[PDB]
Scaffold this active site. Structure first.
Site, PDB file in Angstrom:
ATOM      1  CG  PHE A  90     -13.316  -8.594   5.411  1.00 36.24           C
ATOM      2  CD1 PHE A  90     -14.249  -8.419   6.436  1.00 36.24           C
ATOM      3  CD2 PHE A  90     -12.319  -7.660   5.225  1.00 36.24           C
ATOM      4  CE1 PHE A  90     -14.172  -7.245   7.251  1.00 36.24           C
ATOM      5  CE2 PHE A  90     -12.183  -6.560   6.066  1.00 36.24           C
ATOM      6  CZ  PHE A  90     -13.166  -6.338   7.027  1.00 36.24           C
TER       7      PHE A  90
ATOM      8  CB  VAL B  17      -4.737 -24.027  14.527  1.00 37.16           C
ATOM      9  CG1 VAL B  17      -3.906 -22.934  13.874  1.00 37.16           C
ATOM     10  CG2 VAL B  17      -6.067 -24.195  13.767  1.00 37.16           C
TER      11      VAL B  17
ATOM     12  CB  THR C 281     -10.811 -13.651   2.084  1.00 37.51           C
ATOM     13  OG1 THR C 281     -11.905 -14.413   2.597  1.00 37.51           O
ATOM     14  CG2 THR C 281     -10.628 -12.410   2.985  1.00 37.51           C
TER      15      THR C 281
ATOM     16  CE1 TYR D 261     -16.634 -19.119   9.913  1.00 38.85           C
ATOM     17  CE2 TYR D 261     -18.365 -17.506  10.201  1.00 38.85           C
ATOM     18  CZ  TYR D 261     -17.069 -17.832   9.893  1.00 38.85           C
ATOM     19  OH  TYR D 261     -16.142 -16.859   9.573  1.00 38.85           O
TER      20      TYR D 261
HETATM   21  N1  LIG Z   1     -13.782 -13.424   4.755  1.00 42.69           N
HETATM   22  C1  LIG Z   1     -14.906 -13.132   5.475  1.00 42.69           C
HETATM   23  O1  LIG Z   1     -15.912 -12.635   4.978  1.00 42.69           O
HETATM   24  C2  LIG Z   1     -14.747 -13.450   6.964  1.00 42.69           C
HETATM   25  C3  LIG Z   1     -15.854 -12.863   7.677  1.00 42.69           C
HETATM   26  C4  LIG Z   1     -15.765 -13.105   9.069  1.00 42.69           C
HETATM   27  C5  LIG Z   1     -14.822 -13.835   9.749  1.00 42.69           C
HETATM   28  N2  LIG Z   1     -13.782 -14.333   8.874  1.00 42.69           N
HETATM   29  C6  LIG Z   1     -12.776 -15.142   9.633  1.00 42.69           C
HETATM   30  O2  LIG Z   1     -11.558 -14.605   9.166  1.00 42.69           O
HETATM   31  C7  LIG Z   1     -10.531 -15.625   9.447  1.00 42.69           C
HETATM   32  C8  LIG Z   1      -9.674 -15.629   8.198  1.00 42.69           C
HETATM   33  O3  LIG Z   1     -10.429 -16.160   7.119  1.00 42.69           O
HETATM   34  P1  LIG Z   1     -10.199 -15.628   5.554  1.00 42.69           P
HETATM   35  O4  LIG Z   1     -11.431 -14.901   5.095  1.00 42.69           O
HETATM   36  O5  LIG Z   1      -8.916 -14.922   5.592  1.00 42.69           O
HETATM   37  O6  LIG Z   1     -10.189 -16.970   4.745  1.00 42.69           O
HETATM   38  P2  LIG Z   1      -8.972 -17.703   3.954  1.00 42.69           P
HETATM   39  O7  LIG Z   1      -9.537 -19.064   3.586  1.00 42.69           O
HETATM   40  O8  LIG Z   1      -8.506 -16.851   2.838  1.00 42.69           O
HETATM   41  O9  LIG Z   1      -7.874 -17.893   5.022  1.00 42.69           O
HETATM   42  C9  LIG Z   1      -7.971 -18.780   6.195  1.00 42.69           C
HETATM   43  C10 LIG Z   1      -6.627 -19.481   6.251  1.00 42.69           C
HETATM   44  O10 LIG Z   1      -6.714 -20.334   7.378  1.00 42.69           O
HETATM   45  C11 LIG Z   1      -5.988 -21.504   7.070  1.00 42.69           C
HETATM   46  N3  LIG Z   1      -6.461 -22.627   7.867  1.00 42.69           N
HETATM   47  C12 LIG Z   1      -7.696 -23.309   7.771  1.00 42.69           C
HETATM   48  N4  LIG Z   1      -7.692 -24.329   8.604  1.00 42.69           N
HETATM   49  C13 LIG Z   1      -6.491 -24.374   9.241  1.00 42.69           C
HETATM   50  C14 LIG Z   1      -5.933 -25.206  10.217  1.00 42.69           C
HETATM   51  N5  LIG Z   1      -6.569 -26.258  10.793  1.00 42.69           N
HETATM   52  N6  LIG Z   1      -4.638 -24.946  10.646  1.00 42.69           N
HETATM   53  C15 LIG Z   1      -4.007 -23.887  10.093  1.00 42.69           C
HETATM   54  N7  LIG Z   1      -4.422 -23.042   9.166  1.00 42.69           N
HETATM   55  C16 LIG Z   1      -5.701 -23.319   8.791  1.00 42.69           C
HETATM   56  C17 LIG Z   1      -6.312 -21.751   5.573  1.00 42.69           C
HETATM   57  O11 LIG Z   1      -5.347 -22.652   4.976  1.00 42.69           O
HETATM   58  C18 LIG Z   1      -6.296 -20.324   5.020  1.00 42.69           C
HETATM   59  O12 LIG Z   1      -4.947 -20.016   4.518  1.00 42.69           O
HETATM   60  C19 LIG Z   1     -11.281 -16.940   9.590  1.00 42.69           C
HETATM   61  O13 LIG Z   1     -11.258 -17.197  11.003  1.00 42.69           O
HETATM   62  C20 LIG Z   1     -12.681 -16.612   9.134  1.00 42.69           C
HETATM   63  O14 LIG Z   1     -13.595 -17.458   9.838  1.00 42.69           O
HETATM   64  C21 LIG Z   1     -13.728 -14.191   7.539  1.00 42.69           C
END
Ligand SMILES: NC(=O)c1ccc[n+]([C@@H]2O[C@H](COP(=O)([O-])OP(=O)(O)OC[C@H]3O[C@@H](n4cnc5c(N)ncnc54)[C@H](O)[C@@H]3O)[C@@H](O)[C@H]2O)c1
Ligand SMILES: NC(=O)c1ccc[n+]([C@@H]2O[C@H](COP(=O)([O-])OP(=O)(O)OC[C@H]3O[C@@H](n4cnc5c(N)ncnc54)[C@H](O)[C@@H]3O)[C@@H](O)[C@H]2O)c1
Ligand SMILES: NC(=O)c1ccc[n+]([C@@H]2O[C@H](COP(=O)([O-])OP(=O)(O)OC[C@H]3O[C@@H](n4cnc5c(N)ncnc54)[C@H](O)[C@@H]3O)[C@@H](O)[C@H]2O)c1
Ligand SMILES: NC(=O)c1ccc[n+]([C@@H]2O[C@H](COP(=O)([O-])OP(=O)(O)OC[C@H]3O[C@@H](n4cnc5c(N)ncnc54)[C@H](O)[C@@H]3O)[C@@H](O)[C@H]2O)c1
Lengths: 251, 248, 255, 247
Positions: free
Chosen positions: C195, C59, C197, C162
């Site tokens: 979450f 992205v 993940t 972050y």
């Molecule tokens: N899991 C938590 O506790 C949590 C809490 C709050 C916010 N989030 C936000 O949720 C969103 C999803 O995260 P997740 O927990 O599903 O983690 P995840 O690592 O399982 O998934 C994130 C995905 O984003 C992709 N990604 C990373 N950099 C990228 C790039 N430059 N271009 C394209 N794809 C890219 C990764 O390859 C991965 O498949 C993120 O924005 C994270 O910051 C997660």
């Protein structure tokens, strides 16, 4: 400078409101301590000297608050600043499981009436007295400062009534500032974290250990300094300021 | 008071940062203006006398910021206060259908880099210099004040880049205060409304409830002095805006 | 109902973005997973069937995101929904006193670039694609959903980068909604708490094995399918716009 | 799915509470409209059929809310959901110079007592009833949804009392969610912008998009999604077309 200003400070007999009076009187202002008759109001007004007097009043009473504002206007000629520090706290869960006890309606109503309705009762009546002032060069006729709490944002277990009262103060800060903008009265609210007042002064020093920095309870004189800055700064209006050492409260 | 404190003020050649320098030097502090070479930094530092010097630096450059901080520390002994006022603005819609015009990635990146990355660059480098101070009687080693904007909360049409940059300052205020708590550095952010500075370079004052005018930079300076003096203000954002709430 | 809508979900190969795609495809939508080449994107899009395809793209790249959007728009005729879940996390103090270590500028820039600039990059390029849609009976042409985090509000020690990037997403949600209101694209941000993940490996270890005790109720990590349900509600509700929604079990994060 | 849940909806005779009841009963839930005796609650409850009844009560009365919850339990067997929509509004400046008129104490108290104390009154009494339920497979015993307003954040001129009442609901959402976490009751608040109910029926033109008043059925949809999502708790959600209110 606050020199020469007349301030009415609710909850002025103790804690934050007392520290406020001491700082403003030490800087030249006149202060009226508005507090209940059973408080140490008269002692503290004596100790602060001739520029501080005690007006016995319960902030939930229209008559008594009007009488204290009347005394302040008679004695000092006008009112320029009002500081609302009068408040109470209670720790009662909405539903206390080990005792199967529902929070009573009357305990919630009492905390609302003192902290929220009492603060509006002083605001509404002091606004009319401040409106009789001539505007200063900047158009200002007065400044009203309220005391909420970080409980408005991170209320803990046991703080439902307290947090509702302080959330109500936060919620009405902006519409009151908008209402009084045509007459030049600023309205600002301070949200203290944990301060060393009778309210808090193991149970205590655990609390205190949770403040990121400085890692201690707030000194009331710190609240008083923020009140002087709010009075002095002409452009601070319609806002709530946390004064809390960066704490965020856990359950 | 602020007497004897040494402040580094980014954006110090103009507007809010210059007004902040004028007030702290008038109260006995020392100020180093950190601003770009194209600015009037040198003439404003000379006008303020020997307790104000100009250190030319772009805040996105860690080389230049670290050189400016070292000049400050060698010239005045220490750094007690940092104020981040360096910033730029643009007014560019995300998407404009009539002209079928998409906001460029570069224009977004430039505002993020100056306003947000530049502010963090100053914070991270000045923190270790403040960490060298012997703690005062209340444990404090320094105070860092940032400038966000009410656009972090009510960003207008055209302000996506500026609002993302200022919402990032808001978002990182608490974790940086928590990071620096163990060495006694407070971190506070001011969010101005609309102020009379060169950043404006004709109907703006009427929106403010009271006072119904643009803010005066010296009112921002006064709030900076209050944040420096109050030992208990930390991890918070303060709006300074005459009670305005921005419409689209 | 999301039946028939075309959704582009960045970060679609894993975690919240994958669960989103699974729910939306199970409700009849079409989903394009946008994620890096070196990921499970392709396999997951095969497992999800014919209405789910993988478009490899970083992205932060204008060209790769535009090529993934173009692939979605040619293939399925339009784009109705964009979900930004791509993101990364790091845990680095601004200054670490014991190690006498300063956060590097490049580690802050990289998190800003992926999380904040990459979400804007997707937003800005998908907005013009959604504006080609015929407006529905209520005027709507699309919905953009972003993922911030509770770290925009209660950033912890180590989360400066972050939280700056997620604060940036919160701060730009309203101005982008106001920018796109004349062409009927709603813009809403979800702020997840903690979450279950693959992102959780970022926390210490003796700190992750601890999370559940901090969440009031339910007292556990979030399940990705709960994020996906909230995404579906945001796509369905016509009046939700310019808002950030915490999805966190009522946690407030301590340092 | 809310199928089978029993919901008590204060303010259920009109506006947002009625549209919530219509949506929930059409999805298979049962609903008790708790509204004043002088409202159209009984007629709206009959029009929704056997799975919707009316419980006449003033939310500021302990006795009348207790009677209403006992009626709900007796009819439907338990209570799973409460939705607080009962509320009133005034438009009175704190001080109005041209009339030289201070806002009265009694007008402020009235608005606080119906909106804030009445919502807490329902919350405290329904929490004891929901705690009688066996927990579902996720530990949950109930869900309480309150109605604040954007006036909790951008109260307009004339809105002091209403904004104070609605800011109090916002302020207490998190401590009540924390208080009820050990019994598995989630607490969430919705803050509507401007909606086409009797409370309102140029305001329409100030909403960024969709550029109109909110339809009550969109508040109802958001209630259903809060009931269905197990992880939404202790939060306030703005439902407002991205409006931000000017003075
Ligand atoms: N899991 C938590 O506790 C949590 C809490 C709050 C916010 N989030 C936000 O949720 C969103 C999803 O995260 P997740 O927990 O599903 O983690 P995840 O690592 O399982 O998934 C994130 C995905 O984003 C992709 N990604 C990373 N950099 C990228 C790039 N430059 N271009 C394209 N794809 C890219 C990764 O390859 C991965 O498949 C993120 O924005 C994270 O910051 C997660
Ligand atoms: N101390 C803290 O940690 C803290 C934190 C956040 C907010 N506050 C708020 O700060 C304000 C000042 O509290 P404090 O800590 O100084 O406590 P305090 O108990 O020392 O002072 C409060 C004063 O208010 C007076 N008061 C109470 N009810 C009144 C009534 N009906 N009419 C008139 N006066 C009345 C009391 O008599 C007392 O003198 C209160 O609003 C409190 O809620 C305190
Ligand atoms: N004036 C307003 O209404 C207003 C309102 C809200 C927030 N602010 C913020 O206040 C801060 C001060 O702005 P101002 O109004 O004083 O404007 P200004 O233009 O008068 O001053 C900003 C200064 O920052 C300097 N600067 C720009 N980019 C730089 C870089 N890369 N490195 C070093 N210096 C750089 C400029 O040369 C200038 O001297 C900015 O962060 C701005 O976003 C301004
Ligand atoms: N309509 C809007 O634009 C709007 C915007 C934001 C918030 N709200 C809030 O939404 C909620 C629902 O209001 P609405 O727009 O549906 O208006 P409404 O007038 O159509 O419905 C409110 C209902 O609450 C009932 N009620 C009032 N006082 C009561 C009491 N003491 N006891 C029991 N019932 C009582 C009324 O009889 C009425 O049936 C209120 O809390 C209102 O403040 C409305």
């Amino acid at each position: 400078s606050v020199k020469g200003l007349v301030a009415v400070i609710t909850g002025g007999a103790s804690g934050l409101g007392l520290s406020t009076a001491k700082r403003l009187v030490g800087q030249g202002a006149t202060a009226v301590l508005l507090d209940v008759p059973n408080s140490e109001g008269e002692t503290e007004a004596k100790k602060l000297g001739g520029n501080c007097i005690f007006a016995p009043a319960n902030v939930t009473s229209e008559k008594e608050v009007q009488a204290a504002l009347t005394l302040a206007k008679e004695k000092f000629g006008r009112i320029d600043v009002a500081v609302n520090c009068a408040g109470i706290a209670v720790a009662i869960k909405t539903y206390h499981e080990k005792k199967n006890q529902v929070h009573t309606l009357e305990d919630f109503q009492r905390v609302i009436n003192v902290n929220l309705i009492g603060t509006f009762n002083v605001i509404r009546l002091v606004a009319g007295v401040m409106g009789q002032n001539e505007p200063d060069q900047g158009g200002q006729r007065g400044v009203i400062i309220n005391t909420a709490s970080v409980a408005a944002f991170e209320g803990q277990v046991g703080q439902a009534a307290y947090s509702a009262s302080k959330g109500g103060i936060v919620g009405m800060t902006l519409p009151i500032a908008r209402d009084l903008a045509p007459i030049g009265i600023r309205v600002v609210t301070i949200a203290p974290g944990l301060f060393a007042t009778p309210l808090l002064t193991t149970v205590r020093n655990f609390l205190a250990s949770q403040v990121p920095f400085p890692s201690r309870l707030g000194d009331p004189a710190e609240y008083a300094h923020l009140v002087q800055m709010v009075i002095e700064n002409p452009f601070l209006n319609g806002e709530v300021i946390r004064l809390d050492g960066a704490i965020r409260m856990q359950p």
